[PDB]
Amino acid sequence: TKAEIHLSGLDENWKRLVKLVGNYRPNRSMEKKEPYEELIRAVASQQLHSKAANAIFNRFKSISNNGQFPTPEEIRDMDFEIMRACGFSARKIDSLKSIAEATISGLIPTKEEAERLSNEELIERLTQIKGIGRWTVEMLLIFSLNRDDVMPADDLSIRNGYRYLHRLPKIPTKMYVLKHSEICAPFRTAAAWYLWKTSKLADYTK
DNA sequence: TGTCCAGTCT
DNA sequence: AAGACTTGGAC
Ligand code: NA
């Protein structure tokens, strides 16, 4: 892709990381899903390591409508106890219900509608919902709406990516990631994907 | 027969 | 706002 080509040519560390990792093969498993579904997966993935986040999300998608993902109506109506059994905190359950209501109301738009809005508009609009921050919308931008120039600086694994990439002693700050990732445009979504891959390199040190 | 730590609101 | 909040892997 043009993204790997651009990223290889940045500096020595990048050219090297991109060769270590290989071709840009993004996970597109969410690209045909409705925004509320990806938003919920992002909520599940807040804070925890991926194995925990997936265990929680997989239990949730498994409690519904002929194997199908729970509809917004179902979620709004759903007993709190069974969402607590999935592993969602009290705060996160509330967020889930807010998401259900915002989807029913149209504050959270359909896929077709969301695709017309700018990154900036989605962030401002969606972070009105309690439980949804910038990072959460950025996951939506990346995993569901095919936005190619998104760097989630607040992401713990993105920062550990730069700790790796730049052979840093300690783990860098949001602002540091903000400063250094500018060179990655207009492909900072691919940059992020490479960064997220650092943790699985034989080279990786915790 | 346990501890710690891997976004968000307040 | 300094800390509570959830489950699971690494020990
Ligand atoms: Na918010």
Protein-to-nucleotide distance from the CA of A77 to the C1' of B10, whole angstroms: 27
* Across all strands, nucleotide nearest A171 (CA–C1'): B6
CB crowding A46-85: b at 16 or more within 10 Å, else e: beeeeeebeebbebbbeeeeeeebbbbeebbebeeeebee
Same-domain pairing of A112 and A58: yes
Burial label for A102, CB within 10 Å (0-12, 13-18, 19+), is buried
Same-domain pairing of A48 and A138: yes
Residues A175 and A178: their CA atoms lie apart, in Å, by: 5
Burial label for A172, CB within 10 Å (0-12, 13-18, 19+), is buried
Same-domain pairing of A17 and A101: no
Distance A87 CA to ligand 1 centre (A): 21
Place of tokens 């996160």: A92
Instruction: Return the number of other C-beta atoms located less than 10 Å from residue A118's C-beta.
Output: 9
Read off the tokens for A36.
Answer: 């509320």
* CATH assignment of the domain containing A75: 1.10.340.30
**Does A91 contact strand B, using a CB cutoff of 7 Å?**
yes
Read off the tokens for A86.
Answer: 């999935």
Protein-to-nucleotide distance from the CA of A50 to the C1' of C10, whole angstroms: 14
Which residues get their CB within 7 angstroms of nucleic chain C?
A 47-49, 51-52, 55-56, 87, 89-92
**Does A198 contact strand B, using a CB cutoff of 7 Å?**
no
The total number of structural domains that make up chain A = 2
For residues A174 and A139, the answer to whether their CB atoms sit within 8 Å is: no
Q: What is the three-state SS of chain A?
A: CHHHHHHHCCCHHHHHHHHHHCCCCCCCCCCCCCHHHHHHHHHHHCCCCHHHHHHHHHHHHCCCHHHCCCCHHHHHHCCHHHHHHHCCCHHHHHHHHHHHHHHHHCCCCCHHHHCCCCHHHHHHHHCCCCCCCHHHHHHHHHHCCCCCCCCCCCCHHHHHHHHHHCCCCCCCCHHHHHHHHHHHCCCHHHHHHHHHHHHHCCCCCC
Residues A70 and A48: their CA atoms lie apart, in Å, by: 22
Inter-CA distances, A66 with A61, A63, A69, A83, Å: 10, 9, 9, 18
Burial label for A105, CB within 10 Å (0-12, 13-18, 19+), is exposed
Q: Tell me which method was used to determine the 3D structure.
A: X-ray
Same-domain pairing of A132 and A75: yes
For residues A157 and A138, the answer to whether their CB atoms sit within 8 Å is: no
Q: What is the residue range of A173's domain?
A: 1-31+148-206
**Does A98 contact strand B, using a CB cutoff of 7 Å?**
no
* Across all strands, nucleotide nearest A55 (CA–C1'): C7
Same-domain pairing of A42 and A143: yes
For residues A136 and A154, the answer to whether their CB atoms sit within 8 Å is: no
* Catalytic positions of A, written as ranges: 155
For residues A95 and A101, the answer to whether their CB atoms sit within 8 Å is: no
Q: In angstroms, what is the C-alpha Rg of chain A?
A: 18
Distance A2 CA to ligand 1 centre (A): 34
Residues A100 and A72: their CA atoms lie apart, in Å, by: 5
* CATH assignment of the domain containing A195: 1.10.1670.40
Burial label for A10, CB within 10 Å (0-12, 13-18, 19+), is middle
